[model samples]
Target: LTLSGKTLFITGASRGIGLAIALRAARDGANVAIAAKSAVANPKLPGTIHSAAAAVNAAGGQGLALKCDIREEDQVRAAVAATVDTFGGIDILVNNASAIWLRGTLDTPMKRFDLMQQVNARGSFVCAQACLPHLLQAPNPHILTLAPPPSLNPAWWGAHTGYTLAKMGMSLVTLGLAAEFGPQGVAINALWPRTVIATDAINMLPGVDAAACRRPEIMADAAHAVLTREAAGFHGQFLIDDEVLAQAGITDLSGYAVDPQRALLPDLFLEE
Candidate 1:
């Protein structure tokens, strides 16, 4: 699938899964707006927006690094305007910026809870609202949120209520937007990993073995598949990476795993 000349506005694109998606699109000569808060590199977390943009350019696409914090609506709006000015129009919006706190109610701080809600659910909504006008006018518009399917199972909520609420809130956003915009020709869907992905976030979950996780490329590939499809035909679906790839005739996924021999660990908020 070639996205040449298309523009993608991706949040939290300075590193990890977000960066992986940007690079994948870049290889297709797509114009990518590397939107994130990391103007300067952190020792604990590497790769700033500038560095991510450089990588995108090196991979064949035109990259525009924007200093953006999705928590701030003004920053997100400004970033979207900059992207439209630079690339002419926006074709895709990847709601990949997220805040994760895996602790239970008593253990999770109010600060952390608020941060998760603001960044995860509210941030996605703000970015979509800012991009919707351009998207509605574009030839093929897509809003892909990095979230899981809505599962009412108590097992998911019992472990981490606040985080689940925030993540599921994103899922709800996908549902609402797809219904509201599907007739208008915008595809709004959620994509999630079937297994744990080996990203910097792995440091947060001590129990998850990084070696047993898949690389971010699996998601990047799956997202490409979804983004390249006809917007009107595919809306409001909760898609898994491997499942999407399988539908696209990419069944051999050994190359995506960090270690094929190791048993893969299930990602949170998914049922086996």
Candidate 2:
């Protein structure tokens, strides 16, 4: 499956799985719009939008770095406009930007809770809305949110209600949009990793063994598999990374492990 000449508008692409996805597309000579707030490199978070863009170009794609906070509609709109101006038009929208605060209600602060809600759910919706007009015009458009399946199992919610609600909201967006736009030909779907991904964000989580996590390339490769599919057939599915890749005839996942010798850790929201 080739994404050559296609344009992808990816959020939070400065580093991690988002950057991995950008690089994957870049290898196919795709145009990537790195719409993220990281303009300057931070010691804590080394990758900046400029650096990601440069890497995209280095990998064979045209990259446009946009300083954007998806929480604001104006900023998201402007970023989409800038991407179109730079890449001509967008063919895919990846809602990869998110905030994580895995604390319970009593332990969570209002600010952190609000940030998660706004960035995870609202941001995904806003970005999708902003890109809709252009997406409608593209030949094979897809909106892929980095969210889990709609799991109502109390096990998923009891520990962290705030984060769960925010993430589920993104899943709900995929449900709503896919139904509304799927018939019209815009494919909307949610994708989540089956195993924990070794990202800078994951490093901040308590008790997570980084070595037990899979590399971001696994998600990127799975995303490529999903996005390259014909939009009409793949709409509305909440897909797991391994499952998607498996469907594409990729079963040997040894190369995706951060430490192949270590036992893998399953990602949250997926039942064991």
Candidate 3:
């Protein structure tokens, strides 16, 4: 149940939920390939790959910062190769990078729509293609995506056609890959937040108070619980963070809130 010598190639590790997961696994002295487009620091952006790698090093894991844009096949292949070359093999892959634009059809331009498509679904697909090779060779391999359970509800789609399609694209990709490879011993699953995650990305959406959200650490810890489990018999599950933690007997989640006194805001695509 330990990730002591495991090597993880994590996308979107520059910041947000991805960085949080990297840090949690890092505490176990895992080898991490911090792959993301944010190689340089940006005041508007959340964080940079360099900072994430440094943090992993500080947290006791071996870190290799790789500037990879998942939309491109060449970059992902090189990053995966680099990770394998540096760390010997890849034990885990986290498809945490996603492009989001919460808006209706007309409000969403083709530019934003295409960007989300390429980055969210397509990005995850290419990463999986590149990493699955090495992951298959590892002892306990897993692929965890930051995508929710697929819903056909019209309200969810009508609310934001472009965003939902792109997000669901990722979910569908996770599902297909699990069906194809999960039986082969790859633990492919999607993990999402039950409540809105308080991060810089939350600022992108209008009218929501970040204080009413849960911290990214909750998602991180949940991912750790999934990755540490044996890959066998665990596949295709669309898991929620709090529920995963509860299953692990860590139910007291008050500390994960930005403001425990405030009522938590539910994330989109969730009925309950």
Candidate 4:
């Protein structure tokens, strides 16, 4: 299925990975809706919904900027409604809004724990429910989640168990939904970057140099390939970025590294 005329509603699209996805899809002439709470620019994080919208337009697609907090059910619903109202219907749902706090069990606060679960797991589920109706009507419907493949090992859970659990919840959602809807015709798959992508969230990671991470454009490119596939046959797969590109027969990994010489740190929820 071609994405030239499709409309995608991406969450947390104000900046970082989300904006990268929007720009990638925009190049295909797809309509992108920037839905996030970054209406006003943060002193630390520089992008806003309006700025993202402008970027989307400049990249060759129509853009809809909306102020949405995924933690709020009403706001999420309203954002989906607004996307449909603007684009006529939603073809792709990119569950990109997630919260992360890398702290040990004792060091993790209840507030941070609650935020991670709600935004990473519940938020994705809520957004999918709200957008599924419109997506079902589209020719090539897809629910592309930015989640890691399920590993359930001690190495991942031993350090930051809470954050890992919350993210895995998203992976589980993709699994269940893909199984239930794959035959019914909707592509439900998870995508994770093989190497860390440079973003504002990296500040949360101790001593992560921005230049040491790959641009989010890599994930955005991989996502486009997933969204363009036939939903009926493609579902229930936890895809890694490098693996996906490998399947596409492109095997150069050097271009993806922030510092090609620096050994890349593997992301969470992976066995290797």
In the range 1-272, model 2's lDDT, one tens digit per residue, is: 79999999999999999999999999999999999998997788789899999999999999899999888899999999998888789899999966888888999999998999899999999999999999999999999999999988897798899999999999998899999988888889999999999987885579888799999999999999988988876689999999999989999999999998899999988987
Cα error of candidate 3 at position 143, Å: 0.6
Model 1 segments beyond 4 Å from truth? Answer: none
* Candidates in descending lDDT order: 1, 2, 3, 4
CA error at residue 69 for candidate 4, angstroms: 0.4
* Model 3 misplacement above 4 A: none
Q: Say which prediction, candidate 1 or candidate 4, comes out ahead on lDDT.
A: 1
TM-score for predicted model 3 compared with the true structure: 0.98
lDDT of residue 243 for candidate 1: 94
lDDT for model 1 comes to 0.92
TM-score of each: 0.98, 0.98, 0.98, 0.95
Model 2 ranges with Cα > 4 A deviation: none
Error of 4 at 244 (Å): 1.2
Residue 141, model 1, lDDT: 95
| Tens-digit lDDT string for candidate 4 (1-272) | 34787899999999989999998898888899998998887788888899999998998888899899898999989998998888899999999965778889999999999999988989889988898888889888899999998776787887898898899889998888888877778998999997777887887788777767887878887888788877778888999888887876768867767677676766656666
Model 1: per-residue Cα lDDT over 104-188, one tens digit each: 8999999999999988999889999999999999988999999999889898898899999999999998899999997798989
lDDT of 2: 0.92
**In model 4, where is the ten-residue run with the lowest total lDDT?**
261-270
Output the better candidate (2/3) by lDDT.
2
Model 1: lowest-lDDT 10 consecutive positions: 201-210
Candidate 4: deviation at residue 109, Å?
0.8
Task: Give the per-residue lDDT of model 3 (tens digit) for 1-272.
Answer: 66888999999889898899999999999999999998788678758989999999999999899999887899999999999989899999999865779878989999999999998999889999999989888999999989999889998889999999999999999999999999999999999999999887777678788899999999999999989998988999999988899989999999999998899999988888
Q: Residue 107 in model 1: shift from native, Å?
A: 1.0
Pairs that collide, model 4: none
